[PDB]
Every structure is written in C-alpha cells, then in structure tokens.
Design a protein around this ligand. Structure first.
Ligand SMILES: CCCCCCCCCCCCCCCCCC(=O)OC[C@H](COP(=O)([O-])OCC(O)COP(=O)([O-])OC[C@@H](COC(=O)CCCCCCCCCCCCCCCCC)OC(=O)CCCCCCCCCCCCCCCCC)OC(=O)CCCCCCCCCCCCCCCCC
Ligand SMILES: CCCCCCCCCCCCCCCC(=O)OC[C@H](COP(=O)(O)OCCN)OC(=O)CCCCCCCCCCCCCCC
Ligand SMILES: CCCCCCCCCCCCCCCC(=O)OC[C@H](COP(=O)(O)OCCN)OC(=O)CCCCCCCCCCCCCCC
Ligand code: HEM
Lengths: 431, 55
C-alpha cells in the first residue's frame, strides 16, 4: 500500500491499493496549457478530444476498457481505466495508439469532425457556464504576457488556425520521454513495474522539453464583461498563492479553509460557520462561497469566488470578506485553527482517497512530476498538526497584507466599485 | 435706513443682518446640494452619463 518510484529512462510510479478493484494505467505528461504559446491555444484540447472520441470507439468495440483524460495547466492525464486482470491489454493499446502510430488517428476527416465538435463545445461553454468562465478570466488577467494566463480550452480564433502540422509539431516538441511518466493506480503490484520497460514499449521522440524563456509573474488587473442580460452576478478575488514544492503549501491551504465554503440555500450550512457567514446571513448578501488556493509549479493562486443574487449589495459582501481576511492576518482564535486543521484533514482524506482510481492516478502524476517523489498522506498528517497560529500569522503577513489583487467576473457586476474600494481596504487603517 | 441719517441703528442693523445672512446661505446651499443629487452632474460632452460612473 506504499507508493514506489524509480528512474529508468521513463519514470514509473505505483500506488497499490487492493481496496478498490478498478485497475488503471496511463501516462501523465508534464506539459500542457502552460507549455504552449498564446497563438496556438487549443492544441491540447484538440489532442484530448481526438483521443477521447476515436480511441474510445476503438477500445470499447475491441476490448473492455473506458479511457478518460484531463488537462488542467500542464498535464495530459490520458488515464486508461481497466479491470484488475486486464492491464497488459490496456498498456499495449496505449503504446500502440497514442505515442505511435499517429497516422491511423489523424485522418483529415476525423480531425475535421473533432475540430467542429470542439468548436461547438467551447462555444456553448462560453455561452452557458459562468463560474468557470470567470475563473479562466481570472487566470488570463493575473498572468498577462506569460505562458500561464492562456486558458485550458482556447479561443475560437486560435482554434480555427491549425490543421495538422501545428498539432504534429507540438507532439514532437512535448511528447518526449524526459518529462513523461507512467502511472498505475489501481490494484496492480509489479506487472506494470516491469512491463513498461520492454523490448520496444517506449515513447518516441527522445530529447528534452524546450525550456520556456519566462516562467510566471503577477500584476493586479480587472477583466469584467458587464452585461445586464444575465440574471445573477459573478466575482472572483485573487491573491498570489504559494507554488508547489515550498514550505508554505499546507499553511496556505489552511489559511484558505478557515473561512470555508458556503451555500446559502442549505439548512445544514447557514447555522454553522464563522463570523462572516453570520454577519452575511443576518441580511441577504451572498449565495455561494469558494475559498480556493490553487498552486502550480511556477506560481499559485489564493482565490475567493462567489456568485451572488442580490445586485445592490455587492459592496457590502466585498467589504465584509476583506475585513475578515484582515482579521485572519491580525488575530485568530485557537479554536478556529483547530477546527480548520480537522476540516482540512478530512478534506484531504476524501480527495486523495476517493474510490475512483482516475483521480488518484492524476494526482500521483502531478506530484511525481512536480515534487519528484510522492508525499504519502501519513507525512502530511504528521506535518499538518504542527501548523500553529504564529506560522499562519507570519504567512498572512506576507501573502495577504497590502498585496495586489485581481478580479474578473461576467454578469451584472456594475455595482462593484472599480479598484480603490476593493484594494486599499485590506488593512482598515487600524491593525 | 433707520431714520433720517446714517447713525447707530443703521450700522447696527446692517452688521446684525450681515452676521445673520450667511447661515441662510448655508441653508440655501444645503438645498442646492439636495436639488443637485436628484440627477447627478452633467457631462462636459453634453451627453448621457448614466452609462458608466466611478465612485
Ligand atoms: C471626506 C471623507 C474622507 C474620508 C472617507 C474615507 O476614507 O472613506 C473610506 C473609508 C470607508 O469606510 P469602510 O470601508 O466602511 O471602513 C472600513 C475600515 O475599517 C475603515 O477603517 P477604520 O475602521 O479604522 O475607520 C475608523 C477610523 C476613522 O477615523 C476617525 O475619523 C475616527 C477617529 O479610522 C481611522 O482612519 C483612524 C486612524 C486615523 C486617525 C487619524 C486622526 C487624524 C486627526 O472610510 C474611512 O476611511 C473613514 C475615515 C474617516 C477619517 C475622518 C474623515 C473626516 C471627513 C470630513
Ligand atoms: C478597552 C476598550 C477598547 C477595546 C478594544 C477591543 C479591540 C477588539 C474590538 C473588537 C474586535 C473583535 O471582536 O475581534 C475579534 C473577532 C474575531 O473574529 P474572527 O477572527 O474569529 O473571524 C475569523 C477570521 N479572523 O472579530 C469580530 O468579531 C469582528 C466582528 C465585526 C467587526 C466589528 C468591529 C467593531 C469594533 C471595532 C473596534 C476597533 C477599536
Ligand atoms: C468635499 C470636500 C473637499 C475638501 C476635503 C479636503 C479634506 C478631506 C480629504 C480627505 C482625504 C482622505 O480622507 O483620504 C483617505 C485616504 C485613504 O486611502 P483610501 O481612500 O484608498 O482607503 C480607502 C479604503 N481603505 O488616505 C489618504 O489620502 C492619506 C493622505 C491624507 C491627506 C490629508 C490632507 C489634508 C488636507 C486638508 C485640506 C483642508 C480641508
Ligand atoms: C455656496 C454656493 C454654491 C455651492 C456650495 C455649490 C456647490 C455645488 C456643487 C458641490 C456642485 C457639484 C459639482 C461641483 O462641485 O461644481 C455644484 C454644481 C452646480 N452648481 Fe453649484 N454651488 C453653489 C452656487 C451655485 C450657483 C449660485 C449656481 C447657479 C446660479 C450654481 C449652479 C450649479 C450648477 C449648474 C451645477 C451643475 C453641475 C453639473 O451640471 O455638472 N451653483 N454646485
């Protein structure tokens, strides 16, 4: 039940778990949206979609195995789920239809059908979703002129201007062996440990990933798309988080989980909570919270996303959330910290140990590429109880106190005051 | 004019009224502000300003 890693050409990792019985084997490429230029955006999306359609049609018809994928910023988590006794076939298919050969896959007809399907999908995502749209806009506005602001889906202008050659060029400049691994989360033990290294079962295109000239940055900005047609409102604050592989990941995660989520239309959420939730609930101010502190290998983001219903009362919601963040960095009760520790413990336990093998496989791939070695949750629990009020005070004195913010929302934001009524009030002039 | 000559009542009344009136001006200008607030302030372009405004 212990994760094993090595380094033999291509990194192979394994998180054995005979609890579940859905074996999964796949790859986790250490590149994606962050590793590609603004002018050719949805190349990763197109890859994922051509796979997820035609290879799905092939695999289900031939054998029994359902293949998924995921792209967040720098992954292509082409996980291929299977039965416990059917991992060799899955690996053989993966190495015979993803790395090579790509001729039977990139026919002009299949590529064009997938291209139009991707266009339709991104279009109706733009026309329907809203919290995801404002989150993508928040990324695109926080990291202007940097290979991290471009979204994980892409723009129609960038989507339309690529046919075959750009796709193959990106394939040959990022589907290498140096920054590609194999993940076997499920209930396999060592068959994957030896079958990945075989006479020829190896990714093509030996070499290295082209290093980006600039990594990441930050700057305060706004991208609002004010349109009164939409019913509700949407906003998303942000403060620069802490990158992965740093002695600040868990303290930032706790500093985010203190305030916690909130759904105003649930009998089991209004009653519980801390000061801001009560002071909001006295009137009607907000309708959802999401304190998220996302982190990436270049830089991380500590955010605060809402989707309210009241339109005249945006300013008061923002003012209260800012005063609560100041309260976080000035003085915190010990019971608050203890409750946060317990909640974050259970949240990590649920997230990392969900029964679905695909989630565990993707997270293991992310960690093995970024951290260089898997961090078993035992050490996380051991090192999480040591987080103390002084440490959080110190961390918030750096990341939060008078630091530039970025917000970006679509809807009836118009009531929101522009910048100096949401920025120069993070200290309330009496600390 | 307080009589047939400029004398004590003349300047006395003039000074008392001078010391009184600016408070009436203050009342009138609080009315001025009240009347202003109903419909904002005009653009220099002489066109509708209801589109965007800053706090
Ligand atoms: C003209 C108006 C200009 C001020 C308006 C302004 O800044 O509004 C933004 C801000 C908006 O209020 P908010 O965002 O609801 O307040 C959240 C903070 O907690 C606001 O900070 P707070 O809660 O600390 O505010 C209370 C108190 C306000 O100070 C006081 O006037 C109380 C003493 O704050 C101070 O600034 C006190 C420390 C400075 C003392 C300086 C003494 C100089 C003599 O209001 C102020 O900052 C008010 C400052 C008032 C100072 C005197 C104004 C005189 C006006 C004539
Ligand atoms: C002697 C006379 C002077 C006494 C001065 C006392 C200083 C503390 C005043 C109350 C602050 C407080 O109460 O802060 C302790 C609690 C802790 O909230 P929390 O940290 O658990 O929120 C979790 C995230 N931090 O804040 C509140 O409830 C805030 C309630 C709204 C704020 C109202 C403030 C109005 C009085 C301001 C007085 C400023 C001077
Ligand atoms: C209508 C009246 C017009 C005349 C009023 C002139 C005096 C009021 C100015 C208040 C500015 C303020 O209070 O400013 C407050 C800002 C706060 O920063 P903030 O607002 O972004 O924080 C908002 C959210 N936290 O700090 C400063 O400016 C500091 C500089 C103050 C300079 C004071 C100069 C005094 C000149 C007096 C002139 C004679 C009167
Ligand atoms: C003590 C006297 C006065 C005070 C305190 C005062 C105050 C103000 C204030 C605060 C405004 C808002 C814009 C600005 O500050 O200029 C304003 C605007 C205005 N005032 Fe006055 N005012 C006074 C006298 C007058 C007088 C005597 C007139 C005209 C006879 C006048 C006509 C206006 C007009 C037309 C505006 C229009 C603003 C707009 O259209 O954009 N005011 N005044």
């Amino acid at each position: 039940a212990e994760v094993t890693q090595l380094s033999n050409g291509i990194v192979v990792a394994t998180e054995h778990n005979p609890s579940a019985h859905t074996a999964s084997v796949g790859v986790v490429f250490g590149s994606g949206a962050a590793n590609e230029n603004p002018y050719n955006n949805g190349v990763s999306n197109l890859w994922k979609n051509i796979f997820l359609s035609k290879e799905n049609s092939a695999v289900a018809a031939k054998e029994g195995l359902a293949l998924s994928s995921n792209i967040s910023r720098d992954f292509q988590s082409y996980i291929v789920s299977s039965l416990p006794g059917s991992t060799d076939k899955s690996l053989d298919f993966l190495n015979q239809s993803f790395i090579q050969q790509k001729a039977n896959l990139l026919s002009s007809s299949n590529f064009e059908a997938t291209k139009k399907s991707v266009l339709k999908q991104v279009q109706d995502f733009e026309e329907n979703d809203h919290p995801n749209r404002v989150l993508e806009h928040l990324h695109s506005t926080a990291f202007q002129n940097t290979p991290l602001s471009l979204p994980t889906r892409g723009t129609l202008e960038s989507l339309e201007n690529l046919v075959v050659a750009d796709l193959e060029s990106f394939a040959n400049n990022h589907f290498l062996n140096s920054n590609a691994v194999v993940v076997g989360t499920g209930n396999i033990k060592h068959e994957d440990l030896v079958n990945s290294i075989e006479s020829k079962n190896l990714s093509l295109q030996t070499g290295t990933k082209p290093v980006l000239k600039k990594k990441a940055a930050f700057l305060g900005s706004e991208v609002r798309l004010r349109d009164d047609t939409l019913p509700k409102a949407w906003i998303s604050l942000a403060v620069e988080g802490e990158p992965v592989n740093s002695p600040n990941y868990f303290v930032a995660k706790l500093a985010a989980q203190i305030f916690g989520s909130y759904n105003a239309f649930e009998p089991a959420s209004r009653l519980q909570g801390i000061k801001l939730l009560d002071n909001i609930q006295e009137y009607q101010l907000c309708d959802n919270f999401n304190h998220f502190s996302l982190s990436y290998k270049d830089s991380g983001l500590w955010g605060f996303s809402t989707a309210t219903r009241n339109v005249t009362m945006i300013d008061d919601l923002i003012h209260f959330t800012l005063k609560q963040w100041n309260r976080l960095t000035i003085s915190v009760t010990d019971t608050e910290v203890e409750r946060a520790k317990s909640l974050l413990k259970l949240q990590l336990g649920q997230l990392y140990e969900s029964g679905n093998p695909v989630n565990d496989a993707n997270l293991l791939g992310a960690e093995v590429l970024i951290k260089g070695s898997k961090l078993s949750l035992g050490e996380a629990f051991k090192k999480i109880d040591a987080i103390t009020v002084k440490d959080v005070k110190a961390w918030a004195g750096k990341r939060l106190w008078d630091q530039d913010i970025a917000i970006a929302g679509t809807g009836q934001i118009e009531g929101l005051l522009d910048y100096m009524r949401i920025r120069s009030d993070m200290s309330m002039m009496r600390w | 004019w307080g009589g047939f000559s400029v004398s004590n009542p003349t300047i006395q009344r003039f000074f008392a009224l001078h010391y009184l009136v600016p408070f009436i001006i203050a009342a009138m200008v609080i009315m001025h502000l009240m009347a202003l607030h109903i419909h904002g302030s005009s653009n220099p372009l002489g066109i509708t300003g209801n589109l965007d405004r800053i706090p």
